[PDB]
Symmetry: D2
Subunit: 127 residues, 4 copies
Amino acid sequence: GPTGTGESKCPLMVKVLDAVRGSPAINVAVHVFRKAADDTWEPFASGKTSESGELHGLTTEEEFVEGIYKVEIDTKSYWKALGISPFHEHAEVVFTANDSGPRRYTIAALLSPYSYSTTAVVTNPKE
Amino acid sequence: GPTGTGESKCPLMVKVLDAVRGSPAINVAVHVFRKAADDTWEPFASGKTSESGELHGLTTEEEFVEGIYKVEIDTKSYWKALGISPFHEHAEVVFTANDSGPRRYTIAALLSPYSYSTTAVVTNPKE
Amino acid sequence: GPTGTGESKCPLMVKVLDAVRGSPAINVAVHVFRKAADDTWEPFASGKTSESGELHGLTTEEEFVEGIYKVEIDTKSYWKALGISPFHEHAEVVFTANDSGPRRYTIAALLSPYSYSTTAVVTNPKE
Amino acid sequence: GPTGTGESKCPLMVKVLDAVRGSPAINVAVHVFRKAADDTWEPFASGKTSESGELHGLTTEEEFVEGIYKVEIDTKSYWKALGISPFHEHAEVVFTANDSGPRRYTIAALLSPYSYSTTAVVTNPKE
């Protein structure tokens, strides 16, 4: 695996899949932002998906406080490397982190050239 | 509302999209079956999607009685003709229809070589 | 093909579906932005989906010049009004448009409380 | 975890997610069929998803020969337990297993009351 800014009990994980080739989406850049008080997006963590299409160790429990986050997936670069013309500039996921709910957040993204789907799996357990 | 093999107030429509090309999926074969009294699948209607990736005129309100129906979409032929060998043999949609009176059903499918999604839009008639 | 805030040969359309109720998503707020010369998002058009879950009349072929556009769909308001508290704050679609002449763009979105999918259908004009 | 008929290097795994609640789909029945020479479907393996929404140990490498398989997911029961009216009778995935391609097959299914998506991840490595 690759990583981000601080690694611990992995409160946040990203998984990206390729719907064209039926495989993990490898070496895809992912940037995480936290919404700041001035309503701007502050860089928070970043990395590249591993050979199993996952990105772990982006943050730690102490750091992952309640707030608004944005996960940006560089889908355009991914398709370009394959010699395929994509529609989207990138894929963005914006969500609120709340302490009330379950503690691990898994963001999954399924990519096609002209379409994507994203889903959140929120649990108590592990990934 | 007519009666037979045509289109009533089109009680059943199919719409198919291609997530690789960002266009309607044209000339896709569709076969519809109804579960008979003896529990086997009987042929009900068939057609091919048009240039807009839609299929209308499959049945009439009179012919479309209460029952369990299967919509089979020939995805494999579609991809092979494009030079791609896909994962699935076909996409199948199975549902109970009209069990509380006549409804209008739109079955939508979004295709990728290794993934598909299907959604139903159900409307309670009148004109 | 007109000119301004209306609908040319409707160059940009949005369609939103609800995967929980099996119906169009009605009264969903949509905001469109264009990336300005200084790299910031400028307001371009806004509307609400109709009873068929579509939004037409956002722009004209003349106003819809080459550029990077963001379509923001207010999913959170939609679900909350239904008594559900959803995962995402909104769904965002970002793309380059018209970089090889005028095209017609349909942006479709399928909504679930913890997941959404978006697809683009691009057509090369004429009438 | 739960299991199927013979457990080994897990050539076939099933993962099911709930798009309404953003969680694993637990205790969902899954039946696997292999297409027989008479063109009928022979029961092959079955089980219920575990608390992480997965089903492993359905088969072994020796048994998983090339052929046509069907994976049936009992989605209707799942929604009914939640007190939600679903559209589909069940979700079906039909595919050919070939020795040429990568060796592990992961079938994932994302469920909503009126929609589902399925994706195949085929790899050399592990799950």
